Amino acid sequence: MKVILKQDVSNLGKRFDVVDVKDGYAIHFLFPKKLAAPLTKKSLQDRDLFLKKQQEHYEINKALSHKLKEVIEQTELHFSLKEHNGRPYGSIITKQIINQAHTKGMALQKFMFKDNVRLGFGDHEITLHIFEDTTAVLKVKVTPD
Amino acid sequence: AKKDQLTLRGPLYGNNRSHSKTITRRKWNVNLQPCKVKTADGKTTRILVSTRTLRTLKKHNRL
Amino acid sequence: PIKKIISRSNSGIHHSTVIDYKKLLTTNKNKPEKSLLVTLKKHGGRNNQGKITVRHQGGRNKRKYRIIDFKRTHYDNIEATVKSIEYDPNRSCFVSLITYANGAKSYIISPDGIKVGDKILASEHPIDIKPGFSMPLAFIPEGTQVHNIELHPKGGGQIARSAGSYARILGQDETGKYVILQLLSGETRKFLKECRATVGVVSNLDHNLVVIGKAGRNRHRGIRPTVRGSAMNPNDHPHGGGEGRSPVGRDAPRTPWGKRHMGVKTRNMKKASTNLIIRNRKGEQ
RNA sequence: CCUGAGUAGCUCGGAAAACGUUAUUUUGAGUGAAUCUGCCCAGACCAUUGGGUAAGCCUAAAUACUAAUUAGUGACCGAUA
RNA sequence: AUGAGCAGGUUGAAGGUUGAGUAACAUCAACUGGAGGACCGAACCGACUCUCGUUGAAACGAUAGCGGAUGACUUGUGAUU
RNA sequence: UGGACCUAAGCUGAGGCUGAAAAGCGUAGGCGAUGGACAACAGGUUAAUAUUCCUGUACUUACAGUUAGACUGAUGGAGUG
RNA sequence: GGACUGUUUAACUAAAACACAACUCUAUGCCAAACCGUAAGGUGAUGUAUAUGGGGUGACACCUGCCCAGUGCUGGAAGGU
RNA sequence: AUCAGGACAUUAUCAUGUAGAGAAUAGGUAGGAGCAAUCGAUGCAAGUUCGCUAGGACUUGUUGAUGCGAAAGGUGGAAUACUACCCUUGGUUGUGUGCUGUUCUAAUUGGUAACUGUUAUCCAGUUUCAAGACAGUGUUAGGUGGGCAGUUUGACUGGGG
RNA sequence: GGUCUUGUAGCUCAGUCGGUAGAGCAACGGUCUGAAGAACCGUGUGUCGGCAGUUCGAUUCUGCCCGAGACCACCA
Structure with a gap:
């Protein structure tokens, strides 16, 4: 299971420094905060080292x-669109935001599915929260063109 | 094959008795569930794992 | 609009009522476009491996399937025009070729309410309520007939597409989706209002009065003579054999595959159309 | 300090042992312990008693035979063989 | 899937064409016409039947009829259960 | 007319998807011709022979020169077969 | 009696059966049940409920009477189970 | 994950009780010759509960320190109140045993649609959308089921069974 | 029949289901039809489901049986 x-x-309410509840294959096995790691780094001698690392x-x-x-x-991002006969033409997929994120030399996640297709356009805010104390x-x- | 592929836990190939009790054989199949294992650089696609193998891997901390 | 068949023969007659079949599927001498023509898979009623799937199929008179575009999301907001009514023997409905005025020809279903030359608009927007205007169920007003029903958003219409097929609308549900649709075969479904559909009824409403008349017409359209299960053989149905009239076997006569068939429902447990019903045939789901 | 983890055992079905599943060997699914300062085994089980160290691995031989080479043998036949 | 034959004698609904005509249609009248699981039947194939055959020339034919042939007629090679 | 060209029902099949093994579906390409497309006819010729061998006559196919004008414009697409 | 043009015991019965037309009953939303395959994959059907799968009757026309007591079917439902 | 709901035995709680006779609604058993009095009586005006229609019981102001006959006159087969037990009968915060109503995406999925590889039907990943812990999944077990099988349906007998 | 329910007048259902058996139907006394049909108003009768228990006046109350409905003919 997960030990990180x-x-x-x-x-619900749960605290870091290793304080989890059994879920099997779930958010505990999928959130970036909780990922599997071998138990060779956890012992009574390694308890203090693990606590120092966690801190x-x-x-x-x-x-x-x-x-x-x-x-x-x-720092912001860039987008553009084309228009045909006074109405929008398609739908928004997270594939392309993965594309723009990778194009700069890093990667995003997949298991945070919370969004639907965005029928609107223009400037807006996408709020994805990865951590617990500071929001992202x-x-x-x-840009309409 | 209708069995787990990473760590091969073969179905129990024995004989089956019941209210039948006839000279035959049977395979007690394995609990193929589409779970995921820990692998670097993504490639964490859904793969069939047995639930006894699932609990053994959970004891071994590899997702 | 049908007409009866006069045999005018010296050996028996037939009792047949046939549509004109020269206004819909109208080509007197047909010169199909060769760059847009395709060849289909022909097993004669068998599986791709060849094994039986239905009893005694066959008799298709060399049908050729015209390509149809039911999604209609690839040319949204562009004003097309009904260009032609193409032949389509593989179906009961003969779809219509249109051409969006950016230079993009395509196919759509043929609903009653489009004429060859009408400037139509297939878009996912609150647009004119006319046939040939594929448009989501959300903005479709209540009490209006609709077809090209689908139950997967951004998937394309699959339900209610045969010639003369339609549906009815009598309200919505408190889910942001699942608009109440009285769908044919008497099913009060609740499919998502985001689903795209064509308002109106598919063409060839005269298809509700067709009469075969002959065994020739029986075998000219993929059907073969069928035999009652009473006159079978042993090991086929228990019905056959014996003197007098062939009985009906067990208290529930069976199929040629060998299973009972009276009053039994074989609905799947993994189809997304059983839970989304208001009233079923005997129950509600 | 160490001396080999889903492995004892429990539940439902199970495979050789005389055994046609009882000790011993075996698990498809829910499970389950420690390394001698240890556990297991010992035709229910336990304590005693004894036996042994485990939940890693290789190894010729005695185990079938005589087609390739060589030689010989026969209460084997003799063309209906 | 690729193919191919159907003579001759045929029929002649509908569709279409024209005048008279009737308040108008109605009604009458006429020609193209060519549809038909349309007809007999040569080609064609089939095989319902009389006799032979039933230690046949034929592992199913010979005599004589018969069915269909403008389509549920005949039909090859390849290919599919 | 085939193969050097490709295509029918359908199939082999690099990869790939399942499945004790075995094995199945399908993909590039390649097949599958009874199809498409490709160009030649008369006279005379052997104990077996012929647009095929010879005579009088053509189409089809690129290069070496060769002179020559023209800006060629695909593999994608438009029409065709 | 059967609808007839018609098909079968491929070689006795090839018919008054069956088939066709027509009449009626049965379940189901795109892997539609139904079916096949061996899971894959695929047909029905590359059909969209005005479609597919099956059942009973059987030119055309009138009907198809009474009855759930029961089998199967249908749905519902506390409780024993 | 979350989420609450109510159930079964449910703590403590509140009301549930007439054959007549018998001050009398008679819940029964039961200590007792006891206990009601500001622990506000004999009761009431009301509110509330129950109600069988006898009227009963709890509560606020009030009756006033007097008696309660439901200690005890009297009772019947069953006698009180206080007092203790069993209740009655259900709720109820209530723990446990089976459970129901929630959502959520995050397990679970996709011949839903698209991008790229692959201008490659089989596909891989990226996704879209759809939902979503349900089903399914291995094992177990209940039921289903001549569609199907290995087989069986004794013998005697003036023939058969 | 063993996991459950369970019975009333000649029949259908209440029961101080312990103390009692009553309402409607064959039937009744009368009634109007010539008379009789047709007729409205009350009942006559009374297995309290039988055996072992309880007892104040008990098959009814409990337990066992007759039963309909449903898991239970030592073995593929």
Whole structure:
């Protein structure tokens, strides 16, 4: 199962530093906060090392979550569209936002399916939350052309 | 094959008795469930794993 | 609009009522387009491997299937025009070729209410309520007949597409979807209102009065003479054999595959159309 | 300090042992322990008693035979064989 | 799927064409016409039947009829259960 | 007329999808011709022979020169078969 | 008696049967039940309920009477199960 | 994951009770010659509950420190009140045993549709959409079931069974 | 029959189902039809489902049986 709980969300109150409840194949087996890791790094001698690692990642993780929040408030994205006879022509798929995310040299996730097709256009906000203490918010601007 | 592929837990190939009790054989098939295993660089596609194998791998912490 | 058949023969007659069949599927001498013509798979009623799927099939008189586009989402918001009514012997409905005015020909179903030359508009938007205007069920007003029903958003119409098929609308549901649709065969379904559908009724309403008349017409359209299960053989149905008239075997006569067939429903447990019903044939689902 | 983890055993069906499933060997599914400071086994089970260290691996031989080479043998026949 | 034959004698509904005609249709009248699981039947194939045959020339034919042939007629090679 | 061309029902089949094995579906390509497309006729010729061998006459197919004008424009698509 | 043009015991009965037309009953939303395949995959059908699968009767026309007591079927439902 | 609901035995709670006679509604058993009085009586005006229509019971102001006859006159087969038991009868915060109503996407899926590989039907990944813990899945077990099988349906007998 | 229900007048259902058996139907006394049909108003009768238990006046109350309905003919 999962023994890494650097962060915490289980659709109810649960806390980091390893505090989970049994779910089998679920959010506990799928959230980026909770991923499987071999038990060779967990023991009474390794308890303190694991706690130190969990702490270090907790502080640096909160710091990086804040910093990413501000930098996405600073750095934005680009989009464009074509129009035909006064009405929209198609639908929006997350395939293409994966494309634009990869094009810059990194990757996004798949198991966060919460969105439907966006029949509208123009500037708006896509809010995907990855962590528990600092929210991640993205602004997407689509230029009508 | 109707059996798990990564770690081959073959169906129990024995003889079956019942209210029947006849000289035959049977395969007690394995609990093929489309679960996922931990693999780097994505490629975590759904694959058939037996539930005894599933609990053994859960004890071995490989998703 | 049908007409009876006068035998005018010196050996027996027939009792047949046939449609004109030269206004729908009208080609006197047909010169089909060769760059748009295809050849189909022909097993004569058998599986692709060849094994039986239905009893004694065969007799198709060299049908050729014209390509049809039922999604109609690939040319949205573009004003097309009804260009032609193409032949389609493989179906009971003969679909219509249109051409969107960016230079894009395509096919759509043939509903009653389109004329050759009408500037039609197939788009997923609150547009004019006319046939040939494929448009989601959400903006379709209540009490209007509709066809090209589908139950998967962004999938294309599959239900209610045969010649003369239609449906009815009498309200919605408190789910943001599942608009109440009285669908044919007496099923009060609730399919998603985001689904795309064509308002109106498919052409060839005269198909409700066709009469075969001959065994020639029986075997000219993929059907073969059928035998009652009473006159079977042993090991086929228990009905056959003996003197006098052949009995009906068990208290429920069987199929040529060997299973009882009286009053039994064989609905699947994995189809997305059983839970989405208001009133079923005897129950509600 | 170590001496080999879904493996004992329990539940439903099970495969050799005389055994046609009882100790011993075996598990498709729910399960389940430790490494001697240890556990298992010992024709229910337990304590004693004894036997052994486990939940990794290879190994010739005695086990079938005489088509390739060589030689010989016959209460084998003799063309209806 | 690729193919092919159906003579001759035929029939002549409908469809279409024209005048008289009737308040108007109605009604009468006429020609193309060619549809038909349409007809006999040469080609064609089939095989319902009389006799032979039933230790046949034929592992099913010979005599004589007969069915259909403008379509449920005849039909080859390839290919499919 | 085939093969050097491809296509019918349908199939082999690089990959691929399932399945004790075995094995099945389908894909590139390749098949599947009774189809499409490809161009030649008369006279005379052996104990067996012929647009095929010879005579008088043609189509079809590219290169070496060769002179020559023209800006060629696909594999994609338009029409055709 | 059967609808007739018609088909069968491929070689006795090839018919008054069966078939056809027509009449009626049965379940089902695109893997539509139904079926096949061996899961894959696929047919029905590459059909869309004005379609597919089966059952009973059987030119045309009038009907198809009474009855759930029961089998099968149908749906519902507390409780024993 | 979440979510609440009510059930069965349900703690503690509140009301449930007439053959007549018998101050008398008679729940029964039962300690008792007891206990009601500001622990506000004999009761009432009302509210509330029950109601069989005897009227009963709890509550606020009130009756006033007096008696309660339901300690006890009297009772019947069953006698009180207080007092204790069994209740009655159901709720109820209530724990456990089976469960129901929720949503959620996150297990689970897709000849739903698209992109790319693949201008490649089989596909891989990316996805769309659809939902969604349901079903399905291995095992178990209940039922289904001549569609199907290995087979069986004794013998005697002036022939058969 | 063993996991369950279970019975009333000649019949249908209440029962102080322990103390009692009553309402409608064959039938009754009368009634109007000539008379009789046709007729309206009350009942005559009374297996309390039988055996072992309980007892104040008990097959009814409990337990066992007659039963309809449903898992239970030592073996593929």
